[PDB]
């Protein structure tokens, strides 16, 4: 077997993430990955096998943020449903701002999956969220905090923010020679996007 090299796998995934965010497309040059990480292609193969394996590992890493935020959403505490939902949605929106390719990446892996892989994706990344929303949103509707709404469709709507961010960055760049989705714009983008989502579900 092989001696461990800590940090390398994480560096490769973060490098891949950077390249993908910059390029406004769900794809990676493997030579660009080695160039920008400083790690050779043998290490890329060792950790991930091939481009497919790299993309699957990136999806898993980036989804962890969304899936983890469910526990806080469902956990027992003092917070109102509205505040709990807002905290969860902000975490989603901040994750999408970091990783605007995230929904497209998930779609690409779903599209190319065999049946076992589609089931894995649903079990790991879709069903946990749909269940959580069915419970949490259901209770909030009953409690009068949220207007009647399909919790599964609501989750779909939320995931849409990634694609909107992706779209804005690509269009502003190519059509307007502007760089949007910058760090300096993060707070305003996040707050507007969270406010819109919350406005769309709260009983007015």
CB-wise, 25 or 52, nearer to its own copies?
Answer: 25
Return the half-sphere exposure (C-beta side, CA atoms, 13 A cut-off) of residue 69.
20
CB-wise, 2 or 188, nearer to its own copies?
Answer: 188
- 8 is an interface residue for its own copies by CB under 8 A: no
Residue of the chain from 119, 142, 143, 179 that contacts its own copies (CB under 8 A): 119
**Minimum separation from the CB atom of position 30 to its own copies (A):** 20
CB-wise, 34 or 159, nearer to its own copies?
Answer: 159
45-74 footprint of its own copies as x/- string (CB under 8 A):
------------------------------
- 25 is an interface residue for its own copies by CB under 8 A: yes
- CA 34 to chain centroid, in Å, comes to 24
- Compute the distance between CA of residue 172 and CA of residue 189 in angstroms, rounded to an integer: 14
Choose one: 12-20, 68-76, 136-144, 154-162; the region binding its own copies (CB under 8 A). 154-162
Tell me which DSSP letter residue 138 carries: H
CB-wise, 75 or 199, nearer to its own copies?
Answer: 199
Tell me which DSSP letter residue 202 carries: B
- Compute the distance between CA of residue 112 and CA of residue 121 in angstroms, rounded to an integer: 12
Q: Judge contact between 159 and 127, C-beta under 8 A.
A: no
- 103 is an interface residue for its own copies by CB under 8 A: yes
- 189 is an interface residue for its own copies by CB under 8 A: yes
Tell me which DSSP letter residue 178 carries: -
* Phi, psi angle pair for 202, to nearest 5°: -65, 135
CB-wise, 26 or 44, nearer to its own copies?
Answer: 26
**Minimum separation from the CB atom of position 106 to its own copies (A):** 8
Of the candidates 14, 181, 199, which has an alpha carbon nearest to the alpha carbon of residue 94? Answer: 181
């Amino acid at each position: 077997d092989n001696l461990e090299t800590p940090g390398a796998r994480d560096l490769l995934l973060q490098t891949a993430s950077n390249i993908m965010r910059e390029g406004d497309v769900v794809d990676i040059s493997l030579s660009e990955l080695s160039l920008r990480s400083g790690l050779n292609s043998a290490l890329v193969k060792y950790y991930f096998g091939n481009k497919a394996g790299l993309l699957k590992a990136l999806l898993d890493r980036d989804m962890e943020n969304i899936v983890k935020s469910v526990d806080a959403l469902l956990a027992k505490d003092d917070m109102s449903p509205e505040a709990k939902l807002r905290r969860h949605i902000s975490k989603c929106i901040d994750t999408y701002y970091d990783y605007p390719y995230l929904n497209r990446l998930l779609m690409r892996l779903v599209r190319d999956s065999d049946e076992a892989e589609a089931k894995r994706i649903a079990d790991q990344y879709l069903l946990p969220l749909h269940r959580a929303y069915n419970r949490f949103i259901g209770e909030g509707v009953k409690a009068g905090v949220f207007r009647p709404i399909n919790p599964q469709l609501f989750y779909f709507t939320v995931t849409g923010a990634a694609d909107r961010f992706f779209s804005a960055r690509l269009v502003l760049k190519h059509c307007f020679d502007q760089d949007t989705l910058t760090e300096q714009l993060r707070d305003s983008y996040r707050e507007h996007t969270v406010d819109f989502i919350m406005a769309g579900i709260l009983a007015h």
